[PDB]
Amino acid sequence: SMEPEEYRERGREMVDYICQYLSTVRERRVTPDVQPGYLRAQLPESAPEDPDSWDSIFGDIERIIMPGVVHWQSPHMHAYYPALTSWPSLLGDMLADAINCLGFTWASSPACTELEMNVMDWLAKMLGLPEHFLHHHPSSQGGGVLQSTVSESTLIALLAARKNKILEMKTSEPDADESSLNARLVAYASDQAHSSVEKAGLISLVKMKFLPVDDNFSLRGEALQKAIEEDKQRGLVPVFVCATLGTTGVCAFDCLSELGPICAREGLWLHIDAAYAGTAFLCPEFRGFLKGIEYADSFTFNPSKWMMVHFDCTGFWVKDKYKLQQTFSVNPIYLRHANSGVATDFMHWQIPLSRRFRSVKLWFVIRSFGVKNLQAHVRHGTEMAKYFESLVRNDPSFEIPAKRHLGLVVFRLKGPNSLTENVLKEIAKAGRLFLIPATIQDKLIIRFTVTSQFTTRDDILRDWNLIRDAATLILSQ
């Protein structure tokens, strides 16, 4: 295939390609002008029997791969939430990919587990999380584990919550089947909760009810209390609440200070989904939204959104690691080792067996930037969003139907939804920026997420002017 000295040469060519790509990404159309199925006719119908040349493989990056790529690292990417890479993150995974160890148990590669434990403790401290989420605190029986997505972390929390409650019910009804007991359960989240919460219910067959929110689109204690009472009247057994800090649609925050005490009193697992907004908790001035965090049984966020670690890298912390491990535990002889009892085996904290050395890139990002520069990044992204917000606020054709707390601004043209729909359609023609919509009540809104750590005021104004140009066209039609 390729010799060591050729790897050295091709590695250099790839490093130089990447440097140029990330440095000039603004010049690219963010969304590609392609139709579904475009790639098939451009590739051979079968794998090559003999080696393709590296010149051909490398040449195909621009020739057939890039033409269909959405450039997520563009400052003109404003869709979804950010997913940011960075130089240190790249370098960290280069090492991990080379070692290519697996860390299902402590024994399968001690460093894979121990670096992760220590970095997850660092990161909990950086976020201002409770000490009972630390592996190494005297009062703790919890800890943080990396996962691949918030989706999976939320599912794990639900699985652990329902397994724990089922075990409790089984002590009183040992003759009852676990799946029969599961049928009694009900879980809750905001009607602004991400679709991953619904999906977790569908996968686990746990009834999931989505609760109304206030005028700030925040889930309040009164709504949860009302739901709990109504469901107990119907013979259902409340088991789990997902409270969201930084909702997908408008980046609202559920009222943890109200929801927490209810979950504690009613014995409900309280899981916090902070996928995006968790990174803001690096900055103490944004920690008002974390008030009540002491009531949480679990917490998750994505460094793979806003903290400049490339995907996959999700943080998931639990207060009670034993509850987590009673959900998943298997014990085949071929995975046993001398230190089972003392050592952390992360296979019991996750769905699959295998896991990789994701903590190298996390460690590298935190060390290379340092905390102060990560904080400065959050603050700058937020300032760029505040600038965009001001541009929109000052234009009387537009309205801003939700508050901007961080890097997401939502807005729409005054008038029927079709105007806003047509603006998005117009912008999609040139693909010079990428935006997607959401709904609040019966109003369609455009979401504008500030993404790239390199975004400047020039980038923001450029993108606003394209949006305004599209609005001017649509309003003339």
Add this chain to the structure above:
Amino acid sequence: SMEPEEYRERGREMVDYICQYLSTVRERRVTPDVQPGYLRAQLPESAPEDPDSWDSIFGDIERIIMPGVVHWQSPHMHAYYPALTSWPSLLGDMLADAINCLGFTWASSPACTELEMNVMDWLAKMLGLPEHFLHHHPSSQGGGVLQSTVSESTLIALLAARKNKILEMKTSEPDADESSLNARLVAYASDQAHSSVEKAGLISLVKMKFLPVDDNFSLRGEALQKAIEEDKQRGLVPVFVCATLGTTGVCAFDCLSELGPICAREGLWLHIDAAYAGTAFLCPEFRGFLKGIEYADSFTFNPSKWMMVHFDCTGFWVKDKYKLQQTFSVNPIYLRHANSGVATDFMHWQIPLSRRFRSVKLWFVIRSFGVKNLQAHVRHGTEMAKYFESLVRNDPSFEIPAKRHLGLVVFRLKGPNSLTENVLKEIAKAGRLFLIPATIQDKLIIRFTVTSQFTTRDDILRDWNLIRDAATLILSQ
């Protein structure tokens, strides 16, 4: 703080480090002499406020990370199954990590989905899988999707199976809770099946029954037929069978030609776990074990074991993609796009939302080696294992209690299990090779897996001699 030009410098340094690391990996002790908790006191208790120097970060690779690493790329790694990296795999993922796009829908990055669809079709053809697993076959309703583990692929298959059966049951019991109907289900696998099958049952609350095997440790049709009939008499509802090709313990193969017809006739989802042995099906001469594959509803194997793609990279194919989508479907406005319904959205084929561009490394590996060289690798690995087998077979103090079909040899000292246990303990002292045990019937066995694509006859002999040294010591104790 790290600047583009500094990335270029450090990228070069990392490439050079990786070249040297992988080239000289035999020199390393494979298993580190460390105790649990070793890392904590070597690291600061908190993240650095200011950027650490890259000299310090690089320096810490050997100083901090490597002393706790199990060297999975060593030819003297013989534990578990292989997990192989390669130069092309590394280079492919470097590109993917820089672009850092997410492919939850076609629109979120078309290339991410289309390269994967086309390469999964390549791979299905390379394995000799039925055409009904191809995306781009006119009559097909199926396709391949990448996953992170076989564990998750097996879980998804069970989730899809139980969902399908529960919907069937709802036709005659429309008011029954899905979770109540789930309680009546039973799924099957060999008693040699990997622990992920058990774990999938635990996660899903589906009853799992592990069936006895023949003298070759193969699950046979008569065992499945007997279990189905007996459980139907008990009022249980058979739903799912996992047939394993290349079992963990001794690399046995279930009798798919017998199990298939039963599953088709009895309406049971048949899922094939070929985690390790799947790569062998690149070579036509090993496809005898694949007889009956036409009856499979799903199939999974790990390129991330033996095919020289670094982890994560699991192939998962299904015959009926809509059954999968029915298990998982959600429809928030913020994930809809202009081609929804016509384009492939892989979020409906998996548990989480986000997914990354894993197909680049897979494409690069397949292209850089070409099919013939991938086949040569499998054959060479098998030849090294055959050599090891002959070394053991020539020594009458040892026995080989199961047949070697591929790169795994199992063996033990004749006599009580304690002899073999004590050989393992002796070898663990120096950690110059890594071995783990399994059980067959009442006998403890040592597993010897050939791993590194660079394994030589000299490496095999070296490792055998260390094992014999241990045996000679133990046999006179």
